Short mmCIF file of C-alpha atoms in Angstrom, two decimals:
data_model
loop_
_atom_site.label_atom_id
_atom_site.label_comp_id
_atom_site.label_asym_id
_atom_site.label_seq_id
_atom_site.Cartn_x
_atom_site.Cartn_y
_atom_site.Cartn_z
CA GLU L 1 113.96 109.54 61.72
CA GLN L 2 112.96 108.40 65.13
CA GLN L 3 112.48 104.59 65.07
CA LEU L 4 112.19 101.56 67.14
CA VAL L 5 113.39 98.05 66.02
CA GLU L 6 112.62 94.95 68.03
CA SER L 7 114.92 91.85 67.96
CA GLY L 8 115.52 88.51 69.58
CA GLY L 9 112.35 86.79 68.46
CA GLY L 10 112.38 83.19 67.07
CA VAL L 11 111.47 79.77 68.20
CA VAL L 12 111.84 79.04 71.89
CA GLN L 13 110.95 76.14 73.76
CA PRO L 14 108.21 76.02 76.59
CA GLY L 15 109.51 76.61 80.12
CA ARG L 16 112.70 78.41 79.07
CA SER L 17 113.54 82.07 78.82
CA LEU L 18 113.89 84.72 76.06
CA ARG L 19 115.42 88.26 76.15
CA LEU L 20 113.97 90.70 73.56
CA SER L 21 115.62 93.96 72.49
CA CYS L 22 114.19 97.31 71.42
CA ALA L 23 116.73 99.36 69.76
CA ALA L 24 115.80 103.11 69.35
CA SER L 25 117.16 105.51 66.86
CA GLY L 26 116.89 109.23 66.54
CA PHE L 27 116.59 110.32 70.08
CA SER L 28 118.25 110.07 73.42
CA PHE L 29 116.90 108.48 76.57
CA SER L 30 117.60 111.35 79.05
CA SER L 31 113.95 112.31 80.07
CA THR L 32 110.25 112.61 78.99
CA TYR L 33 110.20 109.18 77.47
CA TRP L 34 108.86 105.76 78.48
CA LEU L 35 109.34 102.61 76.33
CA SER L 36 106.62 99.80 76.61
CA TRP L 37 106.37 96.31 75.34
CA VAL L 38 102.94 95.39 73.83
CA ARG L 39 102.23 91.88 72.42
CA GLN L 40 99.56 90.37 70.05
CA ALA L 41 99.05 86.65 69.56
CA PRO L 42 98.28 85.39 66.13
CA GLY L 43 94.65 86.43 65.23
CA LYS L 44 94.04 88.13 68.65
CA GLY L 45 94.07 91.48 70.27
CA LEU L 46 96.76 93.88 71.78
CA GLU L 47 97.91 93.25 75.16
CA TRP L 48 100.13 95.72 77.15
CA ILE L 49 103.00 94.11 79.18
CA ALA L 50 105.30 96.69 80.83
CA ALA L 51 106.96 99.95 80.47
CA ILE L 52 110.25 101.65 81.65
CA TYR L 53 111.12 105.23 82.17
CA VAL L 54 114.20 105.95 80.16
CA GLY L 55 116.38 108.28 81.97
CA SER L 56 118.46 107.99 85.12
CA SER L 57 115.48 106.92 87.60
CA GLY L 58 114.60 103.91 85.43
CA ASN L 59 111.16 103.28 86.94
CA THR L 60 109.38 100.06 85.81
CA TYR L 61 105.49 99.56 85.43
CA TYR L 62 104.25 96.09 84.96
CA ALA L 63 100.83 94.87 83.92
CA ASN L 64 99.34 92.83 86.82
CA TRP L 65 99.33 89.52 84.84
CA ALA L 66 102.92 90.09 83.87
CA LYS L 67 104.41 90.74 87.25
CA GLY L 68 106.87 88.11 88.52
CA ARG L 69 107.24 86.64 84.88
CA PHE L 70 108.58 89.49 82.79
CA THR L 71 111.55 91.95 83.57
CA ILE L 72 112.13 95.08 81.62
CA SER L 73 115.47 96.91 81.76
CA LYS L 74 117.35 99.63 79.85
CA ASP L 75 120.68 100.59 78.53
CA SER L 76 121.01 104.48 77.82
CA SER L 77 124.34 104.19 76.33
CA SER L 78 123.07 102.25 73.33
CA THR L 79 119.43 103.41 73.57
CA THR L 80 118.24 100.00 73.87
CA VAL L 81 115.51 98.51 76.25
CA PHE L 82 115.19 94.92 77.10
CA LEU L 83 112.36 92.55 77.89
CA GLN L 84 113.12 89.33 79.82
CA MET L 85 110.52 86.58 79.42
CA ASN L 86 110.61 83.68 81.92
CA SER L 87 108.85 80.33 82.25
CA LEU L 88 107.53 80.77 78.58
CA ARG L 89 104.45 79.04 77.79
CA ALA L 90 102.63 78.24 74.52
CA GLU L 91 100.13 81.03 75.00
CA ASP L 92 103.08 83.53 74.74
CA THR L 93 103.49 82.99 71.01
CA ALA L 94 102.82 86.36 69.67
CA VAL L 95 104.33 89.55 67.89
CA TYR L 96 106.14 91.71 70.46
CA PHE L 97 106.19 95.37 69.79
CA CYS L 98 107.87 98.09 71.73
CA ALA L 99 106.20 101.61 71.72
CA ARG L 100 107.12 104.93 73.07
CA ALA L 101 105.22 107.42 75.11
CA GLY L 102 106.13 111.06 76.06
CA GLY L 103 107.78 113.97 74.80
CA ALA L 104 107.23 117.74 74.93
CA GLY L 105 104.57 120.09 73.46
CA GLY L 106 101.64 117.63 73.62
CA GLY L 107 100.23 119.21 76.85
CA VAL L 108 99.61 115.79 78.69
CA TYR L 109 101.33 112.63 78.33
CA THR L 110 100.51 109.02 80.07
CA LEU L 111 101.49 105.52 79.14
CA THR L 112 98.31 105.48 76.96
CA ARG L 113 99.66 108.01 74.68
CA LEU L 114 101.88 105.42 72.51
CA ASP L 115 102.61 107.45 69.33
CA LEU L 116 105.76 105.72 68.11
CA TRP L 117 105.93 101.86 67.22
CA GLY L 118 108.24 99.37 65.92
CA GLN L 119 107.08 96.73 63.42
CA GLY L 120 107.22 93.84 66.19
CA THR L 121 109.28 90.49 66.29
CA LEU L 122 107.56 87.12 66.32
CA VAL L 123 108.06 84.80 69.20
CA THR L 124 106.95 81.28 68.85
CA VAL L 125 106.96 79.11 72.03
CA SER L 126 107.17 75.48 70.91
CA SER L 127 109.13 72.25 71.21
CA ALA L 128 108.62 71.35 67.41
CA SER L 129 111.73 71.40 65.34
CA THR L 130 112.22 72.99 61.74
CA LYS L 131 110.60 71.15 59.00
CA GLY L 132 109.87 72.03 55.42
CA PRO L 133 106.36 71.63 54.10
CA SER L 134 104.75 68.87 51.95
CA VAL L 135 103.04 70.51 49.07
CA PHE L 136 100.24 68.86 47.45
CA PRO L 137 98.03 69.92 44.49
CA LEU L 138 94.38 70.69 44.82
CA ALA L 139 93.50 69.40 41.34
CA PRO L 140 90.71 71.12 39.47
CA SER L 141 87.75 68.82 38.65
CA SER L 142 84.30 69.20 37.70
CA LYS L 143 83.53 69.55 41.45
CA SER L 144 85.67 72.68 41.61
CA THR L 145 84.36 74.38 38.58
CA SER L 146 81.18 76.50 38.14
CA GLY L 147 80.12 79.12 35.47
CA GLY L 148 83.25 79.40 33.39
CA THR L 149 85.51 79.40 36.43
CA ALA L 150 87.57 76.66 37.90
CA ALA L 151 89.30 76.41 41.41
CA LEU L 152 92.70 74.87 42.02
CA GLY L 153 95.29 75.15 44.65
CA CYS L 154 98.16 73.98 46.70
CA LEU L 155 98.13 72.37 50.23
CA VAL L 156 101.26 73.33 52.13
CA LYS L 157 101.11 70.74 54.95
CA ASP L 158 103.23 70.00 58.01
CA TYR L 159 105.90 72.68 58.24
CA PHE L 160 107.52 74.64 61.25
CA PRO L 161 107.93 77.49 62.07
CA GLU L 162 106.02 80.25 60.27
CA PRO L 163 106.15 81.52 57.73
CA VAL L 164 105.77 80.21 54.17
CA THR L 165 105.33 82.22 51.04
CA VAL L 166 103.33 81.09 48.02
CA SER L 167 103.09 82.43 44.67
CA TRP L 168 101.63 81.22 41.42
CA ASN L 169 103.34 80.74 38.03
CA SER L 170 106.60 82.51 39.62
CA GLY L 171 104.42 85.52 40.13
CA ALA L 172 102.70 85.90 36.64
CA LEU L 173 99.35 84.81 38.15
CA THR L 174 98.04 87.25 40.69
CA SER L 175 94.23 87.71 40.11
CA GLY L 176 92.04 85.24 41.86
CA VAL L 177 94.74 83.96 44.21
CA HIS L 178 93.37 83.31 47.81
CA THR L 179 96.07 82.07 50.37
CA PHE L 180 94.61 81.37 53.73
CA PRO L 181 95.95 81.95 57.13
CA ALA L 182 97.90 78.94 58.24
CA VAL L 183 96.51 76.65 61.02
CA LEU L 184 98.49 75.23 63.90
CA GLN L 185 97.73 71.52 64.13
CA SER L 186 97.84 69.22 67.18
CA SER L 187 101.10 67.73 65.89
CA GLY L 188 102.80 71.34 66.42
CA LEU L 189 103.11 71.68 62.63
CA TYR L 190 101.45 74.29 60.46
CA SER L 191 99.48 73.86 57.36
CA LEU L 192 97.90 76.27 54.94
CA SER L 193 96.19 76.41 51.59
CA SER L 194 96.55 78.59 48.46
CA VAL L 195 93.81 78.53 45.90
CA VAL L 196 93.39 80.45 42.56
CA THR L 197 90.40 80.71 40.33
CA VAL L 198 90.95 80.58 36.57
CA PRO L 199 88.83 80.27 33.34
CA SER L 200 87.53 76.78 32.93
CA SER L 201 88.70 77.02 29.16
CA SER L 202 92.42 77.52 30.26
CA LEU L 203 92.90 74.15 31.93
CA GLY L 204 94.77 71.88 29.63
CA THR L 205 96.09 75.01 27.47
CA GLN L 206 97.68 76.69 30.45
CA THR L 207 99.90 75.31 33.08
CA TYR L 208 99.68 76.28 36.77
CA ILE L 209 102.74 75.89 39.28
CA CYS L 210 102.55 77.04 42.84
CA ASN L 211 105.89 78.13 44.21
CA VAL L 212 106.39 77.57 47.86
CA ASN L 213 109.09 79.05 50.00
CA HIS L 214 109.84 78.06 53.60
CA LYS L 215 113.17 79.91 54.39
CA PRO L 216 113.61 78.37 58.00
CA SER L 217 114.22 74.89 56.33
CA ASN L 218 115.67 76.22 53.09
CA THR L 219 112.83 74.35 51.27
CA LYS L 220 111.76 75.46 47.80
CA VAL L 221 109.05 73.67 45.82
CA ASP L 222 107.55 74.03 42.40
CA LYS L 223 104.28 71.85 42.26
CA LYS L 224 102.65 71.71 38.92
CA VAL L 225 98.76 71.52 39.54
CA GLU L 226 96.90 69.89 36.77
CA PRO L 227 93.58 68.04 36.13
CA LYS L 228 93.48 64.51 36.97
CA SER L 229 92.39 61.51 34.61
CA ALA C 1 92.00 95.22 88.83
CA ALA C 2 90.50 96.89 85.81
CA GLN C 3 88.62 95.22 82.98
CA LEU C 4 87.89 97.15 79.80
CA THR C 5 85.01 96.00 77.67
CA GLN C 6 84.77 97.10 73.77
CA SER C 7 81.52 96.65 71.87
CA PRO C 8 80.64 95.45 69.43
CA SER C 9 83.46 92.83 68.67
CA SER C 10 82.85 93.42 65.01
CA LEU C 11 80.34 95.56 62.80
CA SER C 12 79.73 95.99 59.05
CA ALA C 13 79.23 99.34 57.51
CA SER C 14 79.34 101.19 54.05
CA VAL C 15 81.40 104.18 53.04
CA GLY C 16 79.69 107.17 54.36
CA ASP C 17 78.05 105.43 57.25
CA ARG C 18 78.37 106.78 60.90
CA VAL C 19 79.93 104.03 63.21
CA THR C 20 80.09 104.23 66.91
CA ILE C 21 82.38 101.84 68.95
CA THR C 22 81.92 101.93 72.73
CA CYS C 23 84.48 101.11 75.43
CA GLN C 24 83.42 100.40 79.09
CA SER C 25 85.58 100.17 82.06
CA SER C 26 85.32 98.41 85.45
CA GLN C 27 86.55 101.44 87.20
CA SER C 28 87.07 105.09 86.33
CA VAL C 29 89.99 105.60 84.19
CA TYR C 30 92.77 107.97 85.61
CA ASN C 31 91.45 111.60 85.95
CA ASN C 32 88.34 110.42 84.17
CA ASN C 33 89.85 110.74 80.82
CA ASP C 34 93.16 108.62 80.64
CA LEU C 35 91.88 106.75 77.56
CA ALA C 36 92.94 106.34 73.77
CA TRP C 37 91.87 104.83 70.57
CA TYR C 38 94.02 102.91 68.17
CA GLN C 39 93.78 101.82 64.58
CA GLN C 40 95.42 98.71 63.27
CA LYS C 41 95.56 97.18 59.89
CA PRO C 42 96.72 93.58 59.05
CA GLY C 43 100.35 93.05 59.44
CA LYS C 44 100.88 96.64 60.58
CA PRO C 45 101.69 98.16 63.98
CA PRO C 46 98.67 100.03 65.64
CA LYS C 47 98.36 103.73 65.23
CA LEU C 48 97.13 106.33 67.64
CA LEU C 49 93.85 107.98 66.49
CA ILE C 50 92.48 109.84 69.80
CA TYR C 51 94.26 110.71 73.03
CA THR C 52 91.35 111.90 75.07
CA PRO C 53 93.28 113.93 77.89
CA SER C 54 94.82 116.35 75.34
CA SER C 55 93.07 115.89 71.82
CA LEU C 56 95.93 115.55 69.20
CA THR C 57 96.94 118.18 66.84
CA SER C 58 97.78 115.25 64.61
CA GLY C 59 96.21 114.22 61.30
CA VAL C 60 92.94 112.64 62.30
CA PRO C 61 90.39 113.77 59.72
CA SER C 62 87.28 115.59 61.32
CA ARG C 63 85.26 112.32 60.99
CA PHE C 64 86.94 110.76 64.02
CA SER C 65 85.89 111.97 67.39
CA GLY C 66 85.93 110.51 70.93
CA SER C 67 83.43 111.34 73.69
CA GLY C 68 82.77 110.08 77.37
CA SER C 69 84.29 110.57 80.76
CA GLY C 70 85.06 108.27 83.74
CA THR C 71 83.85 104.78 82.83
CA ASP C 72 82.20 104.89 79.28
CA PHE C 73 83.78 106.08 76.15
CA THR C 74 82.70 106.18 72.56
CA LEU C 75 84.50 106.38 69.19
CA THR C 76 82.58 107.80 66.28
CA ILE C 77 83.47 107.87 62.77
CA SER C 78 80.94 110.15 61.12
CA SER C 79 81.44 109.32 57.55
CA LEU C 80 83.46 106.01 57.20
CA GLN C 81 86.02 106.11 54.50
CA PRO C 82 87.60 103.14 52.70
CA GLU C 83 90.91 103.59 54.52
CA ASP C 84 88.93 103.24 57.81
CA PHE C 85 88.11 99.62 57.55
CA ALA C 86 90.49 98.07 60.24
CA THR C 87 90.42 97.03 63.81
CA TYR C 88 90.08 99.67 66.43
CA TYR C 89 91.26 99.37 70.11
CA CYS C 90 90.55 101.34 73.16
CA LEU C 91 93.47 101.57 75.88
CA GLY C 92 92.61 102.64 79.41
CA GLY C 93 95.01 104.06 82.10
CA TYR C 94 94.44 104.07 85.88
CA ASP C 95 95.71 105.41 89.05
CA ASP C 96 97.90 102.39 89.24
CA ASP C 97 99.51 101.93 85.78
CA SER C 98 99.50 98.04 86.59
CA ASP C 99 95.85 98.07 85.64
CA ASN C 100 96.36 99.66 82.32
CA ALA C 101 94.69 97.49 79.50
CA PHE C 102 93.58 97.40 75.89
CA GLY C 103 89.90 96.53 75.23
CA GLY C 104 89.39 93.32 73.06
CA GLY C 105 89.16 95.39 69.80
CA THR C 106 86.39 96.14 67.20
CA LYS C 107 86.77 94.93 63.68
CA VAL C 108 85.02 97.32 61.20
CA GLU C 109 84.35 95.37 57.95
CA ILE C 110 82.82 96.36 54.62
CA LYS C 111 78.98 95.64 54.41
CA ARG C 112 77.60 94.12 51.19
CA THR C 113 74.68 92.22 49.99
CA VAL C 114 74.16 88.73 51.48
CA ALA C 115 75.63 86.03 49.13
CA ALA C 116 75.60 82.26 49.33
CA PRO C 117 78.85 80.25 49.14
CA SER C 118 79.97 78.29 46.24
CA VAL C 119 81.33 75.19 47.87
CA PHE C 120 83.98 72.90 46.02
CA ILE C 121 85.37 69.67 47.33
CA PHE C 122 89.01 68.19 46.72
CA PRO C 123 89.80 64.57 47.43
CA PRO C 124 93.29 64.01 48.86
CA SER C 125 96.10 64.06 46.05
CA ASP C 126 97.64 60.73 44.92
CA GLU C 127 100.95 62.22 46.03
CA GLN C 128 99.79 62.51 49.76
CA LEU C 129 98.13 59.17 49.62
CA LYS C 130 101.46 57.32 49.07
CA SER C 131 102.59 59.01 52.33
CA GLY C 132 100.21 57.35 54.63
CA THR C 133 97.99 60.47 55.36
CA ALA C 134 94.77 61.74 53.62
CA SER C 135 93.76 65.44 53.63
CA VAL C 136 90.38 66.36 52.08
CA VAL C 137 89.73 69.94 51.61
CA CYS C 138 86.37 71.88 51.38
CA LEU C 139 86.46 75.39 49.56
CA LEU C 140 83.66 78.08 50.33
CA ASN C 141 84.08 80.97 47.97
CA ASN C 142 82.32 84.27 47.40
CA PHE C 143 80.13 84.42 50.40
CA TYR C 144 78.91 87.13 52.87
CA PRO C 145 78.45 87.50 55.78
CA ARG C 146 81.47 85.69 57.32
CA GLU C 147 79.71 83.52 59.58
CA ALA C 148 79.43 79.86 58.14
CA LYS C 149 79.31 76.47 59.52
CA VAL C 150 81.11 73.56 57.88
CA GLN C 151 80.47 70.02 58.97
CA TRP C 152 82.39 67.15 57.75
CA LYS C 153 80.51 63.83 57.27
CA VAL C 154 82.27 60.47 56.30
CA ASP C 155 79.83 57.72 55.28
CA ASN C 156 77.11 59.81 56.91
CA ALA C 157 79.02 59.86 60.22
CA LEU C 158 79.35 63.45 61.53
CA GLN C 159 83.08 64.15 62.11
CA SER C 160 84.40 66.19 65.14
CA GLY C 161 87.94 67.06 66.06
CA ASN C 162 89.95 65.95 62.86
CA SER C 163 89.21 69.21 60.82
CA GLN C 164 90.40 72.74 60.88
CA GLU C 165 89.54 75.87 58.99
CA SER C 166 90.66 79.45 58.24
CA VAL C 167 89.18 82.47 56.51
CA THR C 168 90.54 85.19 54.15
CA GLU C 169 90.08 88.90 54.68
CA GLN C 170 87.46 90.47 52.52
CA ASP C 171 88.02 89.99 48.97
CA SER C 172 89.54 93.12 47.48
CA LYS C 173 86.94 93.16 44.40
CA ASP C 174 83.73 91.95 45.86
CA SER C 175 84.17 92.22 49.66
CA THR C 176 83.30 88.40 49.91
CA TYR C 177 85.07 85.89 52.09
CA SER C 178 86.56 82.59 51.10
CA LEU C 179 86.85 79.60 53.61
CA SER C 180 89.16 76.60 53.58
CA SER C 181 88.52 73.51 55.80
CA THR C 182 90.84 70.58 55.88
CA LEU C 183 89.65 67.22 57.22
CA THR C 184 92.71 64.97 58.01
CA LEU C 185 92.51 61.19 58.23
CA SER C 186 94.92 58.33 58.30
CA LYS C 187 95.27 56.58 55.01
CA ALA C 188 93.82 53.35 56.61
CA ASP C 189 90.76 55.37 57.74
CA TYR C 190 90.24 57.13 54.62
CA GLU C 191 90.46 53.76 52.68
CA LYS C 192 87.93 52.17 55.06
CA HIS C 193 85.12 54.54 53.90
CA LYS C 194 83.34 55.74 50.67
CA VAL C 195 81.45 58.93 50.91
CA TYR C 196 83.17 62.14 51.73
CA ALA C 197 80.91 65.09 52.33
CA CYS C 198 81.29 68.64 53.16
CA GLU C 199 77.92 70.17 54.43
CA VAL C 200 77.66 74.04 54.56
CA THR C 201 75.23 76.15 56.52
CA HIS C 202 75.04 79.71 55.68
CA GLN C 203 72.57 82.71 55.90
CA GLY C 204 72.36 82.92 51.87
CA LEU C 205 71.13 79.47 51.67
CA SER C 206 67.60 78.47 52.68
CA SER C 207 68.75 75.02 53.87
CA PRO C 208 72.34 73.50 54.25
CA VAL C 209 74.15 72.46 50.93
CA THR C 210 76.44 69.42 50.65
CA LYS C 211 79.32 68.81 48.30
CA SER C 212 80.47 65.17 48.32
CA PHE C 213 82.59 62.62 46.16
CA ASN C 214 82.96 58.75 46.55
CA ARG C 215 86.60 57.90 46.77
CA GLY C 216 87.61 56.15 43.64
CA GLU C 217 85.03 57.66 41.35
CA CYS C 218 86.10 60.10 38.72
CA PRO O 22 91.24 117.73 87.52
CA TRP O 23 94.59 117.38 85.54
CA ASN O 24 96.02 120.41 87.72
CA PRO O 25 99.00 121.38 85.35
CA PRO O 26 101.92 123.48 86.78
CA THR O 27 101.78 127.28 86.34
CA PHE O 28 104.36 129.40 84.61
CA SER O 29 104.42 132.93 86.19
CA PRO O 30 103.83 135.80 84.85
CA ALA O 31 102.19 135.42 81.42
CA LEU O 32 104.74 138.12 80.29
CA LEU O 33 108.06 139.20 81.46
CA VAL O 34 109.24 142.45 79.99
CA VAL O 35 113.06 143.11 80.65
CA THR O 36 116.00 144.97 79.25
CA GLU O 37 118.94 143.22 77.44
CA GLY O 38 121.55 142.06 79.90
CA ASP O 39 119.17 141.56 82.79
CA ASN O 40 118.19 138.71 84.96
CA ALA O 41 114.86 137.35 83.86
CA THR O 42 112.78 134.98 86.28
CA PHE O 43 109.83 132.83 85.38
CA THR O 44 108.34 130.91 88.26
CA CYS O 45 106.91 127.36 87.66
CA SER O 46 104.64 126.16 90.36
CA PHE O 47 104.19 122.19 90.67
CA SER O 48 101.69 121.72 93.54
CA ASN O 49 102.86 119.37 96.24
CA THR O 50 103.38 116.05 94.50
CA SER O 51 107.18 116.07 95.24
CA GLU O 52 107.97 112.47 95.97
CA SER O 53 109.29 111.34 92.46
CA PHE O 54 109.30 113.89 89.57
CA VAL O 55 111.50 115.89 87.03
CA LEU O 56 110.68 119.51 85.97
CA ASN O 57 111.78 120.69 82.53
CA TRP O 58 112.15 124.20 81.19
CA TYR O 59 111.26 124.63 77.57
CA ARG O 60 111.27 127.37 74.88
CA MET O 61 109.31 127.18 71.80
CA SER O 62 111.19 127.77 68.40
CA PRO O 63 109.62 129.36 65.34
CA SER O 64 108.61 126.03 64.17
CA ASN O 65 106.58 125.18 67.42
CA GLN O 66 109.16 122.67 68.60
CA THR O 67 110.13 122.28 72.28
CA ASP O 68 113.74 122.81 73.25
CA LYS O 69 114.76 121.92 76.83
CA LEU O 70 116.79 124.72 78.58
CA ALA O 71 117.45 123.20 82.01
CA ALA O 72 115.73 120.66 84.46
CA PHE O 73 115.18 120.72 88.17
CA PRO O 74 117.39 117.57 89.10
CA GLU O 75 120.00 119.16 86.79
CA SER O 84 124.95 127.53 82.70
CA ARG O 85 122.77 130.25 81.05
CA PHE O 86 119.52 128.83 82.14
CA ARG O 87 119.19 127.88 85.81
CA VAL O 88 116.21 126.22 87.61
CA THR O 89 116.36 126.43 91.49
CA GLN O 90 113.84 125.11 93.88
CA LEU O 91 112.07 127.36 96.40
CA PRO O 92 111.76 126.72 100.12
CA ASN O 93 108.14 126.24 99.24
CA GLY O 94 108.55 122.66 97.95
CA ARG O 95 106.00 123.49 95.20
CA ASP O 96 107.52 126.71 93.63
CA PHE O 97 110.41 126.75 91.33
CA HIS O 98 112.56 129.77 89.68
CA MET O 99 113.50 129.39 86.16
CA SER O 100 115.84 132.14 85.20
CA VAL O 101 117.84 133.37 82.25
CA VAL O 102 121.12 134.85 83.45
CA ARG O 103 122.35 137.12 80.90
CA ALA O 104 119.38 138.26 79.01
CA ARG O 105 119.62 138.80 75.22
CA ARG O 106 117.32 139.93 72.35
CA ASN O 107 117.59 136.60 70.61
CA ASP O 108 117.05 134.75 73.92
CA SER O 109 113.53 136.47 73.65
CA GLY O 110 110.43 134.50 73.06
CA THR O 111 107.84 131.89 74.51
CA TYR O 112 108.36 129.54 77.35
CA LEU O 113 106.77 126.92 79.49
CA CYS O 114 107.47 124.09 81.88
CA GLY O 115 106.81 120.53 82.06
CA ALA O 116 106.33 118.18 85.23
CA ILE O 117 107.25 114.57 84.68
CA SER O 118 105.67 112.39 87.40
CA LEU O 119 107.07 108.81 87.74
CA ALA O 120 105.01 107.64 90.75
CA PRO O 121 102.26 106.83 91.69
CA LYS O 122 101.24 107.60 88.16
CA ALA O 123 103.38 108.04 85.19
CA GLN O 124 102.66 111.60 83.79
CA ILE O 125 103.73 114.64 81.86
CA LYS O 126 101.75 117.78 82.40
CA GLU O 127 102.90 121.02 80.66
CA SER O 128 102.21 124.50 81.92
CA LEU O 129 100.49 127.04 79.67
CA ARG O 130 102.99 129.18 77.75
CA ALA O 131 104.42 132.64 78.87
CA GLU O 132 106.15 135.27 76.79
CA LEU O 133 109.62 136.91 77.42
CA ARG O 134 110.20 140.32 75.70
CA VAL O 135 113.41 141.97 76.68
#
């Protein structure tokens, strides 16, 4: 029943600040416990930021690179820990996890013994503004078919921020679907591709629609993908 | 200042194989064993596997073991299971906790037979062309291993800086990869030229393969 | 090299209604720390009974600096069981080191 839940993520503009929260459930902050913030940029590795002793003394511990730009603090009365992030820069876009160390019965505890984690919250540092994608068909042609299988798909271009979901035929088509990681373009907008491989004999007998959802912009697109003349 | 180096950055293995991942520190970790290993799966938080200073009574199957003391550490998976393919991270603690850091991680992926990519090319849609922008995409499907080189050519001029790509995780049925590359041009530039070519270099090809089209030809 | 505290003696035998005193020794290292007194329950869970920075279970520091008296005031027969102490260091290095366990008999 013990839980950590991170909140406060979202779009923040470079050079500004953001405060994140870690709300704990199932235990009290009196002693034996430290809460840590750990981050992970899209597609990269884990990175430890800082930790705080929950309990009266409130000692803080900061990674060398984070000192003077991040501030960690606590509120025992609502079992919540805070991470203050200043002078935000683009490389700070990441998922931010809080993790707990400590307890009793385990013999030895240090800050490397992080045995309880939240799901993390996404912070994107960017000056772009919310924009729904343009959905374009990747039409199946002789140049996309081989050995009984044809490739078709949807290009979901120029949206902000993450995420977007794609499905095919309202969810009836699931085998052969490959949706790719998005790419961040120099415009500051994202773009991704979703392709499905289907029998060559089905084209012209079976219709294919990709269903694109971008909730930040309240965009919903059904794009029929068919062969071209 | 402590720097923690993890090797290799990725490896491929089959179920049943023994894998060793090593982790080496600039300076001795605290009390010579303040070091842990973590498993992470896509979209999921990391999970503690090994806590060296007091080996866990948790649910690590016997096949996981850590060794090493001071500055060099090893994670061994003696009989790799399907659920073990994941990324693994070491985490070092030091006399000053301000030095604590993760290693860069080791991705353990599924080994298979080498397989050359199927390559497909898609011209920009007529919908997008009305908008003033042209995106041409090149799809690489069913290949192994992951390393692949996509080179765009426009009228046999080799493109740089106007394309981007991304790769799937290993395919759930045959453990291959797929790759999507997008070359993006202005409509004006797209309509100045004729031959759009996607040239692919991969281990499974004895020499590079090219898929191309002439705009206005179909 | 971990040097965990000690919990003296491995076995107290007492009679019901009697003062029972364990003694937990956390060598030197007295600059920023908390010391917990635990009892294990049937299910191998750890229950805090008192702590040095702080009435049936009293923890009192000794003149030594390093030695601590951890004592049950009115012994009982269900107060009986297995105990240990935990040293929580906050500086220079964040740490918990637990003692080995000892038995109370009464």
